[PDB]
Amino acid sequence: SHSKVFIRSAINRVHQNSAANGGELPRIVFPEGTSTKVLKALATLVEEKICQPILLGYPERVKEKIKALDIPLLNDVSIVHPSSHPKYFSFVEKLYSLAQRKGINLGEAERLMADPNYFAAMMVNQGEADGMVSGSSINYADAVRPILQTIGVYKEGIPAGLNFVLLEDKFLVLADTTVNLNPTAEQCAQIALQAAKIVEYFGIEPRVAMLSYSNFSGAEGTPRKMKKAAEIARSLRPDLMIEGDMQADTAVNPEIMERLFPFSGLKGGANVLVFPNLESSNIAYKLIQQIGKAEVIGPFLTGVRRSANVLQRTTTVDGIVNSVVFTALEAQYIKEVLKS
Amino acid sequence: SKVFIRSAINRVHQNSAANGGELPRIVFPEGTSTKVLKALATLVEEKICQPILLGYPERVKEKIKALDIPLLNDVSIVHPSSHPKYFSFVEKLYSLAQRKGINLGEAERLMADPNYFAAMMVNQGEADGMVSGSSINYADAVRPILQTIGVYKEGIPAGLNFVLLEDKFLVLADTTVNLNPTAEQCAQIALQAAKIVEYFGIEPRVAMLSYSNFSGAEGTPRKMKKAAEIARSLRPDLMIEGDMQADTAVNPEIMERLFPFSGLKGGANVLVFPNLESSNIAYKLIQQIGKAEVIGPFLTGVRRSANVLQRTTTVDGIVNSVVFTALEAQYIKEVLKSR
Amino acid sequence: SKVFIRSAINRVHQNSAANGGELPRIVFPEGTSTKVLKALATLVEEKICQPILLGYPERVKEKIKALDIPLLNDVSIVHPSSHPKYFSFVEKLYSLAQRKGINLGEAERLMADPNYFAAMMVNQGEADGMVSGSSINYADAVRPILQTIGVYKEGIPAGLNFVLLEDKFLVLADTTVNLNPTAEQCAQIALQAAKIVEYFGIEPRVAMLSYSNFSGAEGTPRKMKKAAEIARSLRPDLMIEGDMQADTAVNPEIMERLFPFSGLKGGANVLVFPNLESSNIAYKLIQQIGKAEVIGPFLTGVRRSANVLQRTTTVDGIVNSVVFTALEAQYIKEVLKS
Amino acid sequence: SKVFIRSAINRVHQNSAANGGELPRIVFPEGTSTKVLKALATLVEEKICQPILLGYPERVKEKIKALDIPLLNDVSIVHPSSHPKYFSFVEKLYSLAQRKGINLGEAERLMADPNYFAAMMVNQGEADGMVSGSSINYADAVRPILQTIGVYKEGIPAGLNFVLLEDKFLVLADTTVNLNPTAEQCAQIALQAAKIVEYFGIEPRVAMLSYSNFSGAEGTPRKMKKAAEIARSLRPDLMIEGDMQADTAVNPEIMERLFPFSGLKGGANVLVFPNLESSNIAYKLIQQIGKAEVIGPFLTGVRRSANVLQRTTTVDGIVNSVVFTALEAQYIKEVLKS
Amino acid sequence: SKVFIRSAINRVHQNSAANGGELPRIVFPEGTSTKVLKALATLVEEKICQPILLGYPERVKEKIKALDIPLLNDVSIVHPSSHPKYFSFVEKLYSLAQRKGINLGEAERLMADPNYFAAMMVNQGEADGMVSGSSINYADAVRPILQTIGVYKEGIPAGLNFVLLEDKFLVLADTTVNLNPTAEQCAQIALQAAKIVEYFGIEPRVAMLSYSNFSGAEGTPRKMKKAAEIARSLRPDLMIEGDMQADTAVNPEIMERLFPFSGLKGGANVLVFPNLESSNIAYKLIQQIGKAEVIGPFLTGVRRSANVLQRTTTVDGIVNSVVFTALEAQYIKEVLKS
Amino acid sequence: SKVFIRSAINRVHQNSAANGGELPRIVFPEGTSTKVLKALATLVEEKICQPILLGYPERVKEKIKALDIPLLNDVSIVHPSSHPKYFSFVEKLYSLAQRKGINLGEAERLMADPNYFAAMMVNQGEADGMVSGSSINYADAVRPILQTIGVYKEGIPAGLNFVLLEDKFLVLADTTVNLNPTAEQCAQIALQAAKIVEYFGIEPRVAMLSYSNFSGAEGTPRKMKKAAEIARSLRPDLMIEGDMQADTAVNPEIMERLFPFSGLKGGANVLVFPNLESSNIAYKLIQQIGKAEVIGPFLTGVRRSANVLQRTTTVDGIVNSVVFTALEAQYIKEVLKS
């Protein structure tokens, strides 16, 4: 429901983006070419003109799965078997060149590149595709490792998972929900900056709360970390309301903030929630998703040079469609930045 | 929904009768707190407790009259340093604390503070429970409680919150006290939370929460797996499992589909957290977004009934907390008699 | 002896006469303290300060009449939460402390406490100095001072004591604040102690104390040797030496006979200690054992004049402390005029 | 004052008599030390010990003749590597040290050093005690003693000093060995200190010193509070208390007024320190500026009588130390008589 | 020496003839490895094992025909995911690892990897041993072995190498697995090495290596000294000694002359190293610049026979490794039957 | 092998002949060492050095005559405390060490030790080099050298050994001094070793050794990879590479076959080790079992020529070390020639 208004606006922005670009739709690689949930989601995704899907796998292995489920319009969609691809040898040498001083010999560089996750990441890095969506079948750290060492982070960026909580008026952004165990104050500032750019993309004023178990205490440990993170972010972005350390209800509820901490620079409630450690971010978004009545979409991987998202291992068919939509949007956004 | 609260009110009444009809004496240090006084208006209607307010009687009565709350006339009001037992209370605090850096003059100043006086009242049986912390931060409110009442043997002070869903309630712990509990401490927190769930006639099913599903890797995955193992040792009759993610823990479908080897079936109703950031942020986010009622936090592990309100609380929040403080006071008074 | 304190009292009078007969206003948070009130009887005759007592005017007068001390009939008495500036002080403390875990209601309770009200009075110029801590432990008395008045730039809060010998006085530091100062902190403590000694027209000679004589081994010998080196670079005109034992430091014959290469001749009169255990135990043992007067401790490194009495103090100790707090208030009020 | 010292001198005399009139054989590794020789002049009149001087006989005798001390002209003189027991001593040290990085040639060189030969003489019963360290730093003097004589079981090596006041004496420890004793070690130091006090017929009253009064806060307050608890369980008949400040410990009026719950009444006469900086600085400052005699340091916890003089000692101090070393040798020679 | 290897080959034949002529079933995960196939040409004439190659059948067959190795035309070839036991193996691996972050689908991919399938074949008795790692790094080849076969009681996985000199052979351990073994672990490594030496009818004489000779100083000297002590208590019939330098260890004349108290006479033939850098570099340097043949490494401490070749191995190395893998497989079959 | 040393002997003769007819004065602290004296018989025949033996002249002479070494009846013999420069040497050591815990009496006693006297002779130009340590452990022999002669600018003290194979020679470092050098220190060791290889007109090719091949993992793999990077930036003309395994380092085929991206080709001839266990064990193992001549260790990084023999050395070992000590002394006298 609230997804459906939010995702439909996102789907429209993908269409506005393809149009005024000749009608080019982003090429997205799916390493799990035989995944039932990926293929069923792709039925929706070509119907809706979101992307050209490129599936990885043994072609007949893939096609006979499609006809078993008989979802018709994946009729002609691209299928690539990594080690049969003409660029396989060039991909192997590039991964070897990247990793030969990280304990990776030519044979394992060959074995890694035959794995669809590495092949997909190299395809995106080398411009054979605009994005990838992986991790339907494997755990997050394994799915994200090929992405970080092949595609990597942009300058001063930090890889950080991000989730949207979709409310009646507003949405909230939560980060970092998937990658960093215990980010420093500097890293928390960088995660907040990345989260704010995403909020701005939707034409919304980002209002950033650095979360703690404390309200404006600044005591040793995380209160001080989250207080310092707010300060660093404010110096790197003096136009944004950024505040901390504060408790979560203090952060989201504007009447709580005004009544208890009127000196605070964050008014109107936070829509960006930065967490102090992975336990808190990862448990929070999952508890909201399971017991709250709010739809949470994501996680989405911020901080990487090209568009690449890891599906949470628990996702539904609706999740995958949402994730591809935002992978397409990100690929289009990255493709316009790259020219100017 | 309010059904869980109405059942608790009914139990408080069921408890009074079969004890002559006496109601637990609940002392409130913040005698002039607007939210506390508004909550008690509701709570005297329901015959939950005999409230004792602390403060200067005239200052308290003028506040009650300013708010136009007629039902609090004649409610007991006590000024700590004018009470007959003050000096005896000062002497007991001094004896508890004179080797913790507290001289007699400092013991006198502390006992004139309503939070210490209330905690001493509960400790000495002059009251059956206390509710504080509407106006001061949690650490300041809980220090007199821990220094005066203390924890029972093998207990650990740990805040606990109820999440009330349509079918079902969850308990969250530890939401207020321990920064980074060890595996041994998380196990003790689980047992404490499990006993509370049992009190309501529900089978406790305990999950040790992590950002990981059954990895046992270094750090909190290993800690929460070890916590589950220790918990299983001391109570082999309970479903206790970890390390696992929160959606795995509460959703019986995710568990059976992805981790069928797990000893926890049917979804967890006890969620033990690995550190204070995760526990504290979670219940406040659940409370603010999503439409589930969250009650608490309640201080477990302490020798007598004493609960600290979150500073962000509403008036209904306070009413809920007093109802369960009265239940806890009635239960602890049965234990104290058996002993 | 009596010469040093009487010379100090005279220096307060020279400063007062040179400012139109003004006396420094000194706040005493412990307005009902028996030892504070008895000490003030001595000090009101000598016209060293205008005392301001904090408390409920009646219980303070009730106690003055119990102790049957007539020259305090006219002493000013202030109840913090009744004072006209109370709410502005509360707002000021709230503003400085609202991101240090202090809400407005807690700022109100702290400012009603005499110790915080005294520190704010000194900070805000309603008084020139304060003296506290006869009745509470040192950490509790000094916290409002450090949180409200604070340290001057690059300064460090450090307790200092004078040991009064027939010839000479010694200065001991840091006797009260820092558990385990670094080499950098020990040099800064030496610098603060050195300026106090110069104020009395004495040449400072600084020893960085250890359990070792010029070994420079790992742990405190190396720390005190590095502290001496840091201090010498920040003050190349002063004799500063370490690491050395306490008898080596104070006895010039031991130094010359055993360590002739040393840059410290004639015996040290500034003794900087390696940790709080050694400083605090030393001045207290000296004070109790052997007959040297020990005065202090005096809180150095802070922006305005504020000293905390040791809880074990006598009535004469308080008298000595008020005298030197008055001199400090006068000195800081001359610096502020620039 | 000196009443305490001749009381000890007389106790040595009553001890030699009723035993055969023999005097304890005390070896001095520093046979050519000016301060040692001048001190021994005083001590042979008083018939305190047979000194055995170590060194080359000719070198030692010309020093005695240079200083014009006629009364040392038939003191025994021993050259380690010429002594009949040298080779057997080398091999006992070699067998003990051959897995601690010491080959046979190095055992020969160590045993030719007077400090090691003296420790071996005392260990092997060729002498009753030793006194060393007038000329070298304490750690170098005490290493042969600890490696050769060692500690008795559950003992800990700890320096101890007597502070002699008009009415009473104080005992201070650990003044020389342990940098940062644990609570367990501090309790053991207290037990050793208490028995030394009992030898003089005095009731030991033990204070564990800190910069805090009965706070138990983290770090040394908790350590010294725990040390008192361990000590009280190991000797429930003694007043042992802590953590407390030094003036609290020694002054009975301060203790009673501020801390009446304390189990220590009448003032402490045994002061156990939390670290070596505080102990070492304290006894040295008292000795130099306090106006009481300080004797020691004396090495406790070791199987036989062996004491290391402080490098800063006077001739007079060396005399005091030898007297109590003689008493200790006599006491240990009665215990060995099992 | 090829003299030593030929004795091993004959011992395999004696073991086979004494078990009905059965030869050990040895799995090779690297079924297409050129060096492995070339080695197997040699190993099928010596009748050492029945080889089982893992891989897809024509890839393995196409490779055999490419290299034109006629004797491997009928060697068994197994494609893991087509094997009838595959799903049973997955369920067993899943049950072992499902609380180590391995879901069922991941257990499926792992079991399709030949290294895991080979390890599970050995674990479940479908083969008697395995040889892997010609093509992948050591830690990747050994992880499936450690996770699947595991270590026996109180065992520790540790690589062991034979250095074959004219007179004697030396054993080196741990050459591949443990970065920084504790004294407890180093003693276990010695015990494991000693049993292997006994198997060849030789008396093991064990040296715990260090950069120090019988010093026992902090760090590695103390570690190797305690390791010698632990091993001696766990095996009082063996000469075990340390800490010592490598030339001291191997040269009996150096031992006799410089450390005659040592319990090791005749030179050590078991050399235990203090960390992985020293063990790994030593055996590789001996192999390259000495003129002694070095065989191994062989994985000790594990429940069944599984050896990982060093990636740098030659074809002769693999032949040497399979011979001793065959011997170990035959030995482990007698233990399993008794 | 005999070629490399004879070439070294001849280069000594050309440098001396180019320098009048003088040969370096080499002082030997161990004047009665049997192995030192037997080696000196060989070396004065070879007209390598002007030897100075330290000790009591009669004790040394009867050792020489007892062993019947006729060519030594005219070698210089010096008793340190009888030498004219003794007291000036004591004063120079006192100045160097008086803030490191060494009093004047300790400086006199240390300077009577031949190891300290020899080091002071080399420092003060009374000799051109020294050779010590045949009879005492390495750390005791090298301490006087480091405390007296010291390290040159940005240098690090590091032991170095030559391994002589038929084709070439390898250099190993640091074999004697640093327990666990940082990445920065390993680079400095590489630079020092590289200069020594250059001195013989050979191209230095440097391997930073690990138990890993180009992994860069945490611990020594990352340390040796970073060390190679630091060394390459300070010396961009040299092949410097790591982290790598030892067989990878020396064998150029293994390198080319398995790691062709590597910048070190033709095999390493400079091997820098990650820790003292690995360097020290490797050179001693090679020396005993590798059937290669190993020369050293030689002390690099020090201002003047001073080498410590390993205690396990042979007579031929000593002869080799003295030859290269002479070459080093001659070379250091051309550098001082600016």
Author numbering:
A (entry chain D): 437 to 776
B (entry chain C): 439 to 777
C (entry chain B), D (entry chain A), E (entry chain E), F (entry chain F): 439 to 776
From the paper:
Distinct from other malic enzyme subtypes, the hybrid enzymes are regulated by acetyl-CoA, a molecular indicator of the metabolic state of the cell. The larger ME isoforms (hybrid enzymes) are predicted to be a fusion of two unrelated enzymes; a catalytic N-terminal ME subunit and a C-terminal phosphotransacetylase (PTA) domain. The PTA domain is homologous to PTA enzymes (that interconvert acetyl-CoA and phosphate to CoA and acetyl phosphate), yet they appear to lack critical catalytic residues and thus acts as a sensor instead.
An extension from d1 (residues 524–550, forming a loop with two helices that we term the 3′ loop) sits over the 3′-phosphate group, interacting via residues R535 and K538. Using HPLC as a readout, we were able to prevent acetyl-CoA binding by mutating R535 that makes a direct contact to the 3′ phosphate group. Variants R535E and R535A abolished acetyl-CoA binding, and generated an enzyme insensitive to allosteric inhibition by both CoA and acetyl-CoA, although these mutants retained ~70% activity to wild-type (wt) MaeB. We were also able to generate structures for R535E, R535A and N718D PTA domain variants, which demonstrate the same features as the wt PTAapo structure.
